[PDB]
Design a protein around this ligand. Structure first.
Ligand code: ATP
Ligand code: ATP
Ligand code: NA
Ligand code: NA
Lengths: 235, 235
C-alpha cells in the first residue's frame, strides 16, 4: 500500500507554516520527517491524520483520494497516529487505557482484545504498571503506554510524533526494534523525532523541512552530508 | 552557596520509588542526575522543590535546614525549577507568560520587568512569537519559553527537568550555552535529561539513579566507563 500527501499547505492568520509539502510512505518502509523547531512537522502530521483542515493539498491511499474523509474515516482506512503531546487517559490504569483503544477493533472478539492488551503490556515491558493510573506514570513509562495505545488500533500506516521523547537509552533500542518489527509486518511508518541519530538509524529515507518548506530528501547518509541541512538544522 | 539533599525517601502505596538519595550542588557548578525511566529522578526533584512531601530526608541551603519550608519559601530562598511537563499558560502570549513570572521579582521596578522580558525573548530567540498564545506554540518553541520562564524567577539554584525535550540540535547548543552562562554567573544547576551525550557534555559531575537508588557518581567520563551504569542504563 501507498500513503501519499500532495502539495499540503497550512496557514495560521496569514502565516504559512506549511507550504507545498509532498511526501510518500509505503508499506514495509520507515520514512523520516525531520527539521528545526517550528518547521511545520506536527502540522503536516495533523493534515494527514485529519486533525486540522488543510488549506490545500491531497491525501491519497493507493488509488483513493481520501482528502474529504474525516478523521474517523481515515483511521478506518488504516491511518494511525501517536501524538507528540500526552494522549494517555489520566484516571485510567495502563490496562484500562489499552482496553479502551482495543474497543475499536471490530476484528477481535472480547477475549481476543484482552489477550492483545496483555500481549502489548508484555511487549512494551509495562506489565508491572498494569493497574497504575496514567497520571501516576513517569514520563518514560507514559510514552511506552502511549506507543502501545497507538499500535492497539492496528493501523496500516503509523505516524509517530516523537516516540523517543523522555525515553531512556535501553527503551530507545526496544522501541527501535518494535518499529522495525512493524515494518517487517507490513506497516508503513512515518516518524519524526528530535533524536536525529536514533531516528535516521531506523529510516530508509527522510524528508527535511524548514520554515514550512521541504529542503531535502534522501537516505540518512545523504541527509547528514547535505550542506544546507547541516547549516539550518544539524548545526 | 551549597544546596544539599540528605537521605531523601519517597514511597507511593508502599512502593519505595526513591530510597536514601543524597546529592549536592554548588554555586557555579552544573551537576547531572540521570538514569533509567521510573528511577525516581522527577520525584527527587519534587522533594527538593517542595512539590511532594518527603517520607524522609533533609533539604539544606548552606547552614540552614529548609526541610520545613513550603514551596514558596524555598523558592524565595533561591530554588528554581523547570518542570518536565508543560508549564506555559496556554491562553497567554509569550510576552504575557514572561511578565507573569516577573511579577514575583521584588528586586525589579515595573519598567525593569518589561526590559527583562524583552531581554529574555532576545536571548531565547523568541521575539517573533511575542504575541503568540502558549497553546499555539510548537513543542520546541514552547520549551524555550518554559526555560525562559524558569530563569525569569532569578533562582540561585535551578533544577532543570528535561530542558532538551523536543528541542532541535541548534537549540540544544543555544540552551547549553545559556546553562554555561548561568553557571558563570554563579547559579548552581541540577539537570536531568534523556539526551545523555548532550547532558554529560555540560555537567562537571553526575549522579546515576536506578530503581530509587544511587548507583554511581563521578565525572562524565567516569560515568560513561562504569560497567554497572552501562548495563542498567546506557545499554
Ligand atoms: N493554532 C495555531 N495558531 C497559530 N500558529 C500556530 C498554531 N499551531 C502551530 N502554530 C505555529 O506553526 C508553526 C509550525 O508548528 P509545528 O507544531 O507544525 O512545528 P514542528 O515542526 O512540529 O515544531 P517542533 O519541532 O518545535 O515540535 C510553529 O511556528 C507554531 O508557532
Ligand atoms: N502519584 C504517584 N503514585 C504512584 N506511583 C507514582 C506516582 N508518581 C510517580 N510514581 C511512580 O514512581 C516512579 C518514579 O517516577 P519518577 O517520575 O520519579 O521517575 P523518573 O526517573 O523521573 O522517570 P522518567 O525518566 O521516565 O521521567 C515511577 O515508576 C512512577 O510510576
Ligand atoms: Na512538533
Ligand atoms: Na521524569
Amino acid at each position: 500500500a501507498t500513503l501519499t500527501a500532495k502539495n499540503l499547505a497550512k496557514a495560521y492568520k496569514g502565516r504559512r507554516v506549511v507550504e507545498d509539502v509532498s511526501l510518500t510512505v509505503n508499506s514495509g518502509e520507515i520514512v523520516g520527517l525531520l527539521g528545526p523547531n517550528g518547521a511545520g512537522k506536527t502540522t503536516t502530521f495533523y493534515m494527514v491524520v485529519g486533525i486540522v483542515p488543510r488549506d490545500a493539498g491531497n491525501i491519497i491511499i493507493d488509488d483513493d483520494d481520501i482528502s474529504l474523509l474525516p478523521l474517523h474515516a481515515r483511521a478506518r482506512r488504516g491511518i494511525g497516529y501517536l501524538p507528540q503531546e500526552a494522549s494517555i487517559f489520566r484516571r485510567l490504569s495502563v490496562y484500562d487505557n489499552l482496553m479502551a483503544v482495543l474497543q475499536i477493533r471490530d476484528d477481535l472478539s472480547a477475549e481476543q482484545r484482552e489477550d492483545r492488551a496483555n500481549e502489548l503490556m508484555e511487549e512494551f515491558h509495562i506489565e508491572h504498571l498494569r493497574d497504575s493510573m496514567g497520571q501516576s506514570l513517569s514520563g518514560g513509562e507514559r510514552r511506552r503506554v502511549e506507543i502501545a495505545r497507538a499500535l492497539a488500533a492496528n493501523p496500516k500506516f503509523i505516524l509517530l510524533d516523537q516516540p523517543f521523547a523522555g525515553v531512556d537509552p535501553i527503551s530507545v533500542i526496544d522501541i527501535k526494534r518494535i518499529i522495525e518489527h512493524l515494518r517487517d509486518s507490513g506497516l508503513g511508518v512515518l516518524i519524526t523525532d528530535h533524536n536525529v541519530r536514533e531516528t535516521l538509524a531506523v529510516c530508509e529515507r527522510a524528508y527535511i523541512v524548514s520554515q514550512g518548506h521541504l529542503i531535502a530528501h534522501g537516505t540518512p547518509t545523504e541527509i547528514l552530508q547535505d550542506e544546507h541541512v547541516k547549516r539550518v538544522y544539524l548545526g
